[PDB]
Amino acid sequence: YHGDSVASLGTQPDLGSALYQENYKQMKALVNQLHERVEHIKLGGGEKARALHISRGKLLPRERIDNLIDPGSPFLELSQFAGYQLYDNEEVPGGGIITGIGRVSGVECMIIANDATVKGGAYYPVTVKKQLRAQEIAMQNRLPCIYLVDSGGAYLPRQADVFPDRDHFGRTFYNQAIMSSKNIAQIAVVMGSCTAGGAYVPAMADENIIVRKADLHCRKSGVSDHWALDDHHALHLTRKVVRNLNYQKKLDVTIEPSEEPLFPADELYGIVGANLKRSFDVREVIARIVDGSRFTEFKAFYGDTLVTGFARIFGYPVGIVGNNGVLFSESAKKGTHFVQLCCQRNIPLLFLQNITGFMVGREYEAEGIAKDGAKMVAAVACAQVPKITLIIGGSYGAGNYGMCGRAYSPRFLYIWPNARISVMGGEQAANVLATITKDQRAREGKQFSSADEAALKEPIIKKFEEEGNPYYSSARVWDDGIIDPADTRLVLGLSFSAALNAPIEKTDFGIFRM
Amino acid sequence: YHGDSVASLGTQPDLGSALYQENYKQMKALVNQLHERVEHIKLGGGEKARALHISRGKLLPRERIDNLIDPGSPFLELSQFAGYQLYDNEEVPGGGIITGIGRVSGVECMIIANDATVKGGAYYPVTVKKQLRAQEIAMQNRLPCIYLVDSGGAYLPRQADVFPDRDHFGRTFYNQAIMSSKNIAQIAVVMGSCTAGGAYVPAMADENIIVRKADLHCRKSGVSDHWALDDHHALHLTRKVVRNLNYQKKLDVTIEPSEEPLFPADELYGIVGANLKRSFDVREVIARIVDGSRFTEFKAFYGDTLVTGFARIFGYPVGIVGNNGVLFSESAKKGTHFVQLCCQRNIPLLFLQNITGFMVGREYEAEGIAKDGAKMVAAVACAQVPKITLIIGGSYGAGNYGMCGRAYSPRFLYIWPNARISVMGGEQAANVLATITKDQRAREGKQFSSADEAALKEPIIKKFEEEGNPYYSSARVWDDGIIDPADTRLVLGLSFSAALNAPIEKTDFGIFRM
Amino acid sequence: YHGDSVASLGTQPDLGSALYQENYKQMKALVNQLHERVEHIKLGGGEKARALHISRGKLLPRERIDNLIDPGSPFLELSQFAGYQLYDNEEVPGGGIITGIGRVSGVECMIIANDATVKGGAYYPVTVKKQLRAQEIAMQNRLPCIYLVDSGGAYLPRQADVFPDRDHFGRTFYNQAIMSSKNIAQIAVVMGSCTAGGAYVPAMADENIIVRKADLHCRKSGVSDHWALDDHHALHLTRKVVRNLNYQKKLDVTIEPSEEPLFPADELYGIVGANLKRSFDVREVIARIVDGSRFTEFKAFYGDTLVTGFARIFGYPVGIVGNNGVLFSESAKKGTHFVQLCCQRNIPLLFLQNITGFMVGREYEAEGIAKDGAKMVAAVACAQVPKITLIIGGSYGAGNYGMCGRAYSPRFLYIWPNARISVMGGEQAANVLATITKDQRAREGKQFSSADEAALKEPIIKKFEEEGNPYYSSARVWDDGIIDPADTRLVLGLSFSAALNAPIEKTDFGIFRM
Amino acid sequence: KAAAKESLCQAALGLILKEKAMTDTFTLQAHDQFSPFSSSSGRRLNISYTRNMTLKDGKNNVAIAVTYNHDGSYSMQIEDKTFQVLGNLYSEGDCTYLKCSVNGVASKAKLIILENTIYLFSKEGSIEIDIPVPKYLS
Ligand SMILES: CC(C)=CC(=O)SCCNC(=O)CCNC(=O)[C@H](O)C(C)(C)COP(=O)(O)OP(=O)(O)OC[C@@H]1O[C@H](n2cnc3c(N)ncnc32)[C@@H](O)[C@@H]1OP(=O)(O)O
Ligand SMILES: CC(C)=CC(=O)SCCNC(=O)CCNC(=O)[C@H](O)C(C)(C)COP(=O)(O)OP(=O)(O)OC[C@@H]1O[C@H](n2cnc3c(N)ncnc32)[C@@H](O)[C@@H]1OP(=O)(O)O
Ligand SMILES: CC(C)=CC(=O)SCCNC(=O)CCNC(=O)[C@H](O)C(C)(C)COP(=O)(O)OP(=O)(O)OC[C@@H]1O[C@H](n2cnc3c(N)ncnc32)[C@@H](O)[C@@H]1OP(=O)(O)O
């Protein structure tokens, strides 16, 4: 029986409120800026290289993606902002590579396409990082990989950062071999010149498609498994190969009919705003994203700062954990309990981080908070269910670790355009450094002047402010993308769908330090 | 029956030869320089901080290690050169942390000790990398971890490189939790101040030892499992805890009595020298290191450039693969065959890299060499037996990948003081860049002058020369240490011994592209 | 998405061509002869024994099969030609036993029925071989076995070939026991006299049905589990027992809607003909049999002599490997690659053999061809996916091994009425023997005359010609039947359907000698 | 007479809707009935998908750029003119009927795609528009 009613979250916000108006203005401005920057990145390497690429008869990489995926299928691009102002004078749109998840012949696949326009498709260090992240995603979620190889090899002026180390270029080939061993299909499509150091990708792959115009490779080397007249033919052949994969999706979770949330998503703009100093109820966000705005809270009156419960997204079950204030002992214990419960029942986990800075409270007895957050950290680390993190606000200190940051391998991690990430708030770091130097130079009997205090403080403030920018964090691959809040639900759906390809296996826990 | 005789490798070198004299002089100079630098690093943070540390009553970290390990046991330190001239003006001896493998109570354990003298034990990015490498080694080889925590938290002026990313500070805790889940003992000894962000390490650990002089932690928090009067008492308690671990070493390989090699090891100095342009027979090295100088070569007349065979080191079986010239198709096929054979019989693998540069030969038809080296790369990547790499000469290009570089996760990787590592030789890179620019500016009709050719070439030459230095590569953690050749055998023994703690599991291979 | 179009094989043959007319005439004559011989075998032991059998009130074995299987279900009979002119003066239709696969109560089952008319149902050696082959098929494909026991025991005048050896009579009981241990149902129906040495079959079986008219067996011995009034009642009881088996078919491969081939099958008669000297494109056959004539070739321009690709038969996926000329190194490597690929994706394999004789080329450097065909042989042997072989032309030498001959345990093996199988061509063997004797008697100084050359040559030619006949090979159980080409598709469907009953398990490969 | 712009717009909409219907048919069989990937939305992160299509009218080849708007309507630009089109296929009796609004003008027809030819039968008449063969095969 599934007929009894359930209470729904969410309340209608006050559209007339001045606070709502101001928050809406600020967040809409941020989203417009994000959209403009994304368009500029989408334009690619430049009109020069684009005209040259077209004159050679080859398709532009975005056109390749459009023709490859199923007609009208949504495409989930990752890390559109890699390399954004990362290097001092060189502009590297999209990191020189395009990675995403899309449905080909009814199968979710991870597509990795080199962009020939950007520096002839050379490999900047950020490009290697992006590709490794994509391969890691595909390995974890058991997704076939399709490479659209139009490469130029390592960027020589930066070889020291691309070639030698463990997470450097060679790891790419390593991943390929491993994913072939675990029976995850590898398809390579040599749509560009087969330059030095590039033939390794087709040779490692399970199956190859090579566009006609090395010649020795198809006729004598035999590296070629298929031989295509041009780009369109190659993409069609790729679709045929994917069909011939003999794969069927196995899902192991209960499914229910999906239902839209009761409240419009754009209202989030008013609720969240751009000021981190003001706070908001995470329950509003949860009401905006989950199915039917139906939510079953767990331990509502204990550890009120954390909000944990069960819901459904597009019919899949999810356990939601979010911050609603300063994390405490009770909140940590509640989180550990909830994580154990979700792991036992094999339910995917969704974290929402809105870590609150310690500027409000001087001490907060970091020892006890640490003693309890350690338990939550261990529980999150040992979990095996799919985990997806979303940073809707500040993310500072060990709380970031506790709420499944990058170090804890969430299947995906996205940030809203108003997030901030750093070890601490800038002013707190300034005070810490000032106190350290003051105490030390007092210990040696040296005098500490207030001018020196300002001299230490100001650079730290500016540096922390600059490094906390979402664009700074997404230029490096610290997140899989910056998403417009109004689309959040949709993205999560796609992500969770992909995460369901892999089977869910049992969770083993370490010693629970009681 | 084990009585029939076996032929032994190695020949007596010509001590009177001028070439031998010169090579001996150069290599001995390199080793003396290495020893002097190691002594200076061993001195630690400085006399100032050392006196301050002693005045507080605490022991110096090296003394801690000496008292902790079994009396007279050899201690295998790793990455003594991390941070060597890595940062512009800051001297960070040993990376601010000391990691090694040593025998405690008859059990091989991985010991990680913070150095309080260096910047109060703060965590530079290189320190995080070193610690993560040590934890990875312990996880792979299933070794108990002992932490001697005297920490100061992240180095704030560099927070952006220490806190946020996947391989940044939080991964430490992640590793701890995981290694606790797989039943690998975690012991933490809080020998210093329990500052902010430090209590997480004791809280994550399985067992704790805390030196008396937080107070709340032992009496009320209950984080303390043991409470020690001072450093000596804490180390004794640690030995007792390790004994109480209830662990017994399980070995799954045949063992034979060990026998010393027939030739003195110091002769290597004459054989190898410091000039990479001259070449030498790897069989000399193999004769110098393996037991009794007994070696059973495999496919001796096919692919002569690669040398593959079986031997014993301290009684353990090893399969040895080394370069003796330019790698070719036949060499790659021989290597793939040998790797499959060793994986089938569960024998550890030892690689010796002496990759030869392509300055001698203009083309070397990189397509066929690539088509075959891909097979060897796949075979090496998919292997599951313990793999140890040693770089005795040049290491360039995809050959580094083929001979199990860092990207392919060897259990250990060491380099001799005369190695060179880079994507290509400097002059080759200069020629490549010059040709690219010349061809392009010809394409646009621009004129290319010889002055511009020199202007491009010289910086590249100097940069590649600088980046290939062993000290440059070991300052970053690209290798687990620079070893005197005269000690090589010994080191390998210890390493292999440690690698035997983990059980050897079956190897799964990808599609062998025939 | 499954909407994009695929190119189809096959071309309309030239019906007006004289070659097509002649080939059609010859092949139609062969098929008519085959049909006539099959009818004569179907007539059974003879009118004498048939009248005697009817007078006793028992049904004829073919009537038993007709009533047993589901109404209108197709029945796949195996080895209709066993014993055809095998013994000098004794005519043994069908080997004295009838074995086939048919659907009973919606379950594929292997039915084995003794023919009482032929020598009172005695067991000739060929009968034992046929029964063992049927039991092997059922064991491999996990099919319930139904025995219709009307036996007479071993044929005493030939006891030395029936009783003592491993593949002699006792192995029957062995198989029964084993197939009972692995939970494969054994049903025995004693429809004839329970003579000496026959009661073992009911006693070994899981369940019994005994026709009333030993009496002691049902009332006191208790061997009887069911007791039937006559044959019709016994068959009905058998259907009820099969229903009570509690079995459900588990399929583990993707299924698509089936579609008929685009070209009529009878055209094969014109394409193939009866002359092995002429050649034809195997792609014509593939177009005639696969679904929709859709085929996705793999490595089309490398090793053109072998044709490998993917297709669907009645909606199941199949990998097709066929000969189109003299096998070479590249062909062998392509075959090995394709076999590995199909094993990885768990796809059934279908081999088509048209091995070409070496009369065209004197040497063909057998050493290299052997060195490469060894790899293909190893790959085929180690494979675990269902394998079905079809011999559409010549089959000679080690090529037969390479294309999955009987020694390599294909689930089924059929031959067309125009095949030839032998170690070599007759003339080649004659030349080899002549050269051996000539060289030897030259070595001893004896003279070799041309009359002696003819004397050696002619008997060998005649003997090889006689032994290569399809009827000769099918008289012994070297194949599971001779099939009219026009029906080939249908047969394959049924066969593959049966092969899907067993689960497909992973393939383990030996050392790939690179 | 030569086909107008709007007829080409209707034909392009019909072909897109048939692709959507095929996607639905594949979805029905699969385990993941409610996965967002099965939607024919063409959504992208922070970008709007534009699909370049070529349709053959008589001898002439005409290129249509179809932008997949968020609302589900399609913005098709052919030459210098942009047309806002929203439509759906529903089955009247046994025949598939396309109802579609081009720039707010509602039209009703019956749509049959056989081989490479799209036939729109309406009261005004019949319009046949040919999908070009990829010609890499066939
Ligand atoms: C794995 C291991 C172990 C090792 C290796 O892999 S070692 C690989 C060595 N690489 C090559 O051997 C490829 C050399 N390229 C070429 O052969 C071509 O160039 C292509 C193929 C790139 C196509 O490019 P293209 O020819 O179509 O156009 P182009 O404009 O010429 O393309 C942009 C131009 O590339 C210049 N450029 C600068 N640095 C590099 C760089 N590192 N790689 C490529 N190009 C670079 C750029 O400065 C200029 O543009 P700019 O700066 O003047 O505006
Ligand atoms: C996990 C997460 C998520 C977050 C975090 O973890 S956020 C952690 C914040 N850290 C602290 O809160 C510890 C603050 N230290 C102290 O409280 C003490 O200092 C000790 C404990 C370090 C003992 O050291 P000590 O007091 O015995 O000696 P001291 O000489 O003072 O030691 C050297 C001096 O440290 C200065 N120094 C500069 N930068 C740092 C730095 N980043 N950390 C520590 N010290 C630093 C150095 O400049 C000077 O020496 P110098 O450069 O003048 O020669
Ligand atoms: C397991 C182990 C470990 C050991 C054993 O199992 S040791 C088993 C010993 N067998 C018996 O103990 C059965 C002896 N048969 C009989 O008791 C009956 O015969 C029946 C039962 C067969 C019914 O047959 P039936 O009586 O209804 O008709 P009949 O015409 O008589 O049937 C044909 C005639 O059988 C003659 N014939 C020749 N050789 C044999 C033979 N080997 N077995 C049977 N019959 C044979 C044939 O020559 C003649 O016909 P033909 O050649 O003259 O035309």
Short mmCIF file of N, CA, C and O in Angstrom, two decimals, chain A residues 254-312:
data_model
loop_
_atom_site.label_atom_id
_atom_site.label_comp_id
_atom_site.label_asym_id
_atom_site.label_seq_id
_atom_site.Cartn_x
_atom_site.Cartn_y
_atom_site.Cartn_z
N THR A 254 14.88 0.36 -5.46
CA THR A 254 13.46 0.50 -5.72
C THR A 254 13.18 1.81 -6.43
O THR A 254 13.82 2.83 -6.17
N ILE A 255 12.21 1.79 -7.34
CA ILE A 255 11.87 2.94 -8.16
C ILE A 255 10.41 3.27 -7.96
O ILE A 255 9.57 2.38 -7.81
N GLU A 256 10.10 4.56 -7.94
CA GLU A 256 8.75 5.07 -7.82
C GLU A 256 8.52 6.10 -8.90
O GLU A 256 9.47 6.67 -9.44
N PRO A 257 7.26 6.36 -9.26
CA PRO A 257 6.99 7.41 -10.24
C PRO A 257 7.51 8.75 -9.75
O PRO A 257 7.41 9.08 -8.57
N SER A 258 8.07 9.52 -10.68
CA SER A 258 8.64 10.81 -10.32
C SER A 258 7.58 11.89 -10.32
O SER A 258 6.56 11.80 -11.02
N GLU A 259 7.81 12.93 -9.53
CA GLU A 259 6.90 14.05 -9.44
C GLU A 259 7.69 15.33 -9.19
O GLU A 259 8.65 15.34 -8.43
N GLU A 260 7.26 16.40 -9.84
CA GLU A 260 7.98 17.66 -9.75
C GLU A 260 7.85 18.27 -8.36
O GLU A 260 6.87 18.02 -7.66
N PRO A 261 8.82 19.07 -7.94
CA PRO A 261 8.71 19.76 -6.66
C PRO A 261 7.58 20.77 -6.68
O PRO A 261 7.17 21.24 -7.74
N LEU A 262 7.07 21.09 -5.50
CA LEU A 262 5.91 21.97 -5.41
C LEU A 262 6.30 23.43 -5.59
O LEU A 262 5.43 24.28 -5.80
N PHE A 263 7.59 23.74 -5.50
CA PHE A 263 7.82 25.17 -5.61
C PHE A 263 8.78 25.48 -6.75
O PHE A 263 9.66 24.67 -7.05
N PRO A 264 8.63 26.63 -7.39
CA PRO A 264 9.54 27.00 -8.48
C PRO A 264 10.98 27.08 -7.99
O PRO A 264 11.25 27.51 -6.87
N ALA A 265 11.90 26.68 -8.86
CA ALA A 265 13.31 26.63 -8.47
C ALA A 265 13.94 28.01 -8.45
O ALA A 265 14.83 28.27 -7.64
N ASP A 266 13.50 28.92 -9.33
CA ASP A 266 14.11 30.24 -9.39
C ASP A 266 13.97 31.00 -8.09
O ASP A 266 14.78 31.90 -7.82
N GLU A 267 12.98 30.65 -7.26
CA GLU A 267 12.85 31.29 -5.96
C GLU A 267 14.10 31.15 -5.12
O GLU A 267 14.35 31.98 -4.24
N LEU A 268 14.90 30.12 -5.40
CA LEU A 268 16.17 29.95 -4.70
C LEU A 268 17.00 31.22 -4.76
O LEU A 268 17.65 31.58 -3.77
N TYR A 269 16.98 31.91 -5.90
CA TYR A 269 17.74 33.15 -6.02
C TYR A 269 17.42 34.10 -4.88
O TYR A 269 18.32 34.66 -4.25
N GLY A 270 16.14 34.27 -4.58
CA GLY A 270 15.77 35.13 -3.48
C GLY A 270 16.16 34.57 -2.13
O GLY A 270 16.58 35.30 -1.24
N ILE A 271 16.04 33.25 -1.97
CA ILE A 271 16.27 32.66 -0.66
C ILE A 271 17.74 32.70 -0.30
O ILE A 271 18.11 33.00 0.83
N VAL A 272 18.61 32.39 -1.27
CA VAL A 272 20.02 32.23 -0.95
C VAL A 272 20.75 33.56 -1.04
O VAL A 272 21.47 33.95 -0.11
N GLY A 273 20.60 34.26 -2.15
CA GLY A 273 21.32 35.50 -2.31
C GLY A 273 22.81 35.26 -2.47
O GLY A 273 23.28 34.14 -2.66
N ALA A 274 23.56 36.35 -2.37
CA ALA A 274 25.00 36.31 -2.57
C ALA A 274 25.80 36.60 -1.31
O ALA A 274 27.03 36.48 -1.34
N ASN A 275 25.15 36.97 -0.22
CA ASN A 275 25.84 37.32 1.02
C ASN A 275 25.91 36.10 1.91
O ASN A 275 24.88 35.53 2.28
N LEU A 276 27.13 35.69 2.26
CA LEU A 276 27.29 34.53 3.13
C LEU A 276 27.01 34.87 4.58
O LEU A 276 26.72 33.98 5.38
N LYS A 277 27.11 36.15 4.95
CA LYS A 277 26.87 36.53 6.34
C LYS A 277 25.45 36.21 6.75
O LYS A 277 25.22 35.65 7.83
N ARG A 278 24.48 36.56 5.91
CA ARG A 278 23.11 36.14 6.15
C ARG A 278 23.00 34.63 6.01
O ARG A 278 23.77 34.00 5.28
N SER A 279 22.05 34.05 6.72
CA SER A 279 21.83 32.62 6.69
C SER A 279 20.42 32.32 6.19
O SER A 279 19.59 33.22 6.05
N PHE A 280 20.18 31.05 5.90
CA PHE A 280 18.90 30.60 5.38
C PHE A 280 18.67 29.16 5.79
O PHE A 280 19.60 28.44 6.17
N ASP A 281 17.42 28.73 5.70
CA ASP A 281 17.07 27.37 6.06
C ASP A 281 17.29 26.44 4.88
O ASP A 281 16.67 26.61 3.82
N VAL A 282 18.15 25.44 5.06
CA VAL A 282 18.43 24.48 4.00
C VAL A 282 17.16 23.74 3.60
O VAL A 282 17.06 23.22 2.48
N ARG A 283 16.17 23.69 4.49
CA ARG A 283 14.93 23.01 4.17
C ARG A 283 14.25 23.65 2.97
O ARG A 283 13.55 22.98 2.21
N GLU A 284 14.47 24.95 2.76
CA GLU A 284 13.92 25.58 1.56
C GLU A 284 14.52 24.97 0.30
O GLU A 284 13.79 24.61 -0.63
N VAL A 285 15.84 24.81 0.27
CA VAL A 285 16.48 24.19 -0.87
C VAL A 285 15.97 22.77 -1.07
O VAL A 285 15.61 22.37 -2.18
N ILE A 286 15.92 22.00 0.02
CA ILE A 286 15.47 20.62 -0.09
C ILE A 286 14.06 20.57 -0.65
O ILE A 286 13.75 19.74 -1.51
N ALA A 287 13.19 21.47 -0.20
CA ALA A 287 11.84 21.52 -0.74
C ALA A 287 11.86 21.85 -2.22
O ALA A 287 11.02 21.36 -2.98
N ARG A 288 12.80 22.68 -2.64
CA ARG A 288 12.81 23.08 -4.04
C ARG A 288 13.32 21.98 -4.95
O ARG A 288 12.99 21.96 -6.14
N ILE A 289 14.13 21.05 -4.44
CA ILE A 289 14.77 20.13 -5.38
C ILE A 289 14.14 18.73 -5.35
O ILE A 289 14.04 18.08 -6.40
N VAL A 290 13.71 18.25 -4.19
CA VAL A 290 13.29 16.85 -4.10
C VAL A 290 11.92 16.67 -4.75
O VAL A 290 11.20 17.63 -5.02
N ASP A 291 11.56 15.41 -5.00
CA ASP A 291 10.32 15.10 -5.69
C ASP A 291 9.13 15.43 -4.80
O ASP A 291 9.10 15.05 -3.63
N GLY A 292 8.15 16.13 -5.36
CA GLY A 292 6.95 16.44 -4.62
C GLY A 292 7.15 17.21 -3.34
O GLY A 292 6.20 17.36 -2.57
N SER A 293 8.36 17.70 -3.09
CA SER A 293 8.68 18.45 -1.88
C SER A 293 8.41 17.61 -0.63
O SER A 293 8.14 18.13 0.45
N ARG A 294 8.49 16.30 -0.78
CA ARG A 294 8.23 15.37 0.31
C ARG A 294 9.55 14.97 0.94
O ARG A 294 10.48 14.55 0.24
N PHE A 295 9.63 15.09 2.26
CA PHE A 295 10.86 14.87 3.00
C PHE A 295 10.52 14.28 4.35
O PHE A 295 9.58 14.72 5.01
N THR A 296 11.29 13.28 4.76
CA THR A 296 11.05 12.58 6.02
C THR A 296 12.25 12.80 6.93
O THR A 296 13.23 12.06 6.86
N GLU A 297 12.16 13.80 7.79
CA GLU A 297 13.30 14.18 8.60
C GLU A 297 13.58 13.12 9.65
O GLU A 297 12.70 12.38 10.08
N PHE A 298 14.84 13.05 10.07
CA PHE A 298 15.33 12.04 10.99
C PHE A 298 16.01 12.74 12.15
O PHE A 298 16.93 13.53 11.94
N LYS A 299 15.56 12.45 13.37
CA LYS A 299 16.05 13.13 14.57
C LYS A 299 15.93 14.64 14.40
O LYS A 299 16.92 15.37 14.39
N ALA A 300 14.71 15.14 14.30
CA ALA A 300 14.55 16.58 14.01
C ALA A 300 14.96 17.47 15.18
O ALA A 300 15.50 18.56 14.91
N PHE A 301 14.73 17.05 16.42
CA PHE A 301 14.98 17.97 17.56
C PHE A 301 16.37 17.80 18.17
O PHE A 301 16.69 18.55 19.10
N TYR A 302 17.18 16.88 17.66
CA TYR A 302 18.52 16.63 18.24
C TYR A 302 19.55 17.07 17.21
O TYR A 302 19.38 16.71 16.04
N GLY A 303 20.57 17.81 17.62
CA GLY A 303 21.53 18.33 16.63
C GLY A 303 20.81 19.08 15.54
O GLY A 303 21.01 18.74 14.37
N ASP A 304 20.03 20.10 15.89
CA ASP A 304 19.20 20.83 14.90
C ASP A 304 20.08 21.48 13.83
O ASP A 304 19.56 21.75 12.74
N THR A 305 21.34 21.75 14.14
CA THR A 305 22.26 22.40 13.17
C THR A 305 22.42 21.53 11.92
O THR A 305 22.59 22.11 10.86
N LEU A 306 22.43 20.20 12.05
CA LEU A 306 22.47 19.34 10.84
C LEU A 306 21.05 18.93 10.47
O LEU A 306 20.25 18.74 11.39
N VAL A 307 20.73 18.85 9.18
CA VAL A 307 19.38 18.40 8.73
C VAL A 307 19.56 17.14 7.90
O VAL A 307 20.12 17.25 6.81
N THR A 308 19.09 15.99 8.38
CA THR A 308 19.25 14.70 7.73
C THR A 308 17.89 14.08 7.50
O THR A 308 17.02 14.16 8.37
N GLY A 309 17.71 13.47 6.34
CA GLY A 309 16.44 12.82 6.08
C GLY A 309 16.46 12.03 4.80
O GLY A 309 17.50 11.87 4.16
N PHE A 310 15.28 11.54 4.42
CA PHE A 310 15.11 10.73 3.23
C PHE A 310 14.20 11.44 2.24
O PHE A 310 13.25 12.12 2.65
N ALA A 311 14.47 11.27 0.96
CA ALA A 311 13.61 11.83 -0.07
C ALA A 311 13.82 11.04 -1.35
O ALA A 311 14.56 10.06 -1.39
N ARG A 312 13.15 11.48 -2.41
CA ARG A 312 13.30 10.86 -3.71
C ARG A 312 13.58 11.93 -4.75
O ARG A 312 12.99 13.01 -4.71
#
